[PDB]
């Protein structure tokens, strides 16, 4: 695995026409998957991280937007990163996106972290674009290698014992962090239960406690659920992703929860910026926003 060569070819598109592909070899991509999978399994499923850190939400294969995020936030390892999942699907360059992220995980395994999103799941990414991209540019076997890698991604992270991070949200099943630690990998994402909820649930201001989720899976939770969770676990903030928000970040429940979404102009219903949350060493948080100029 010539890591520096792979990263170099991935970063050669930097400055060129948006949409130009990097066609790594199948062996190089498989090498990224196998080596990153080993590192994921060697680290906890519930990461314990320290600030300073930049935290990013959904990317969805918008590779040049990922490069802009790194340009603004600082390329690894000048800044430490935590991504909240959803690297693939929807966008045109899921492969470049995931390959660069896996390469940085291998290169800087103690300063660069990737959580699992609901799209790092074969049932979802078979439909939402990643299967098609793998079948067109490579083959179906490579898609299955990615699945085996994704099945080993960690599920949540706690920053300085005070910020709880996951892709989706809370679960009505979650009373103890030990319940997360007891999840064994590799695993698929079930359509019900704790792991499903961590990747799929959503906050909702119109629900008292736990409610149904219009997506047809998991649940919604209200502001009082957030407050109770934070108090029970001596936490200050939930940081999650999974929903398109206009400014790239959005608070919920008196700044006790924030949603991050990092793929600009993702939808057709509204323009949206992408945001990252910067957490300094003292846990002071701010947002860096990538906004299309018009």
């Amino acid at each position: 695995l010539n890591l520096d060569s792979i990263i170099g070819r991935l970063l050669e598109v930097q400055g060129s026409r948006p949409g130009k592909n990097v066609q790594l070899t199948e062996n190089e991509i498989r090498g990224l998957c196998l080596k990153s999978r080993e590192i994921f399994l060697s680290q906890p499923i519930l990461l314990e991280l320290e600030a300073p850190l930049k935290i990013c939400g959904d990317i969805h294969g918008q590779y040049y937007d990922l490069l802009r995020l790194f340009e603004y936030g600082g390329f690894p390892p000048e800044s430490n990163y935590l991504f909240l999942g959803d690297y693939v699907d929807r966008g045109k360059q899921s492969l470049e996106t995931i390959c660069l992220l896996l390469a940085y995980k291998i290169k800087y395994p103690e300063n660069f972290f990737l959580l699992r999103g609901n799209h790092e799941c074969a049932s979802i990414n078979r439909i939402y674009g990643f299967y098609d991209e793998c079948k067109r540019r490579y083959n179906i076997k490579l898609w299955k290698t990615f699945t085996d890698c994704f099945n080993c991604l960690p599920i949540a992270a706690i920053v300085d014992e005070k910020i709880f991070c996951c892709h989706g949200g809370l679960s009505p099943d979650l009373q103890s962090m030990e319940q997360i630690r007891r999840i064994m990998r590799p695993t698929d994402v079930p359509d019900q239960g704790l792991l499903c909820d961590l990747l799929w649930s959503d906050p909702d201001k119109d629900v008292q406690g736990w409610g149904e989720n219009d997506r047809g899976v998991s649940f919604t939770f209200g502001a009082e659920v957030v407050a109770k969770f934070l108090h029970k676990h001596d936490l200050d903030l939930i940081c999650r992703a999974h929903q398109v928000v206009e400014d790239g970040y959005e608070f919920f429940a008196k700044r006790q929860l924030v949603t991050l979404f990092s793929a600009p102009n993702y939808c057709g219903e509204f323009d949206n910026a992408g945001a990252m949350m910067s957490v300094d060493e003292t846990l002071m948080c701010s947002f860096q926003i990538l906004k299309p100029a018009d």
Binding site: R68, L283, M284, C285, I289, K291, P292, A293
Partner: peptide, 22 residues
């Protein structure tokens, strides 16, 4: 020290970088 946000202390909460897609 509790988690805080930069606008608690007179800093900008956000910094915005506008970009041209091309």
């Amino acid at each position: 020290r509790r988690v805080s946000f930069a606008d608690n202390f007179g800093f900008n909460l956000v910094s915005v970088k506008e970009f041209d897609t091309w």
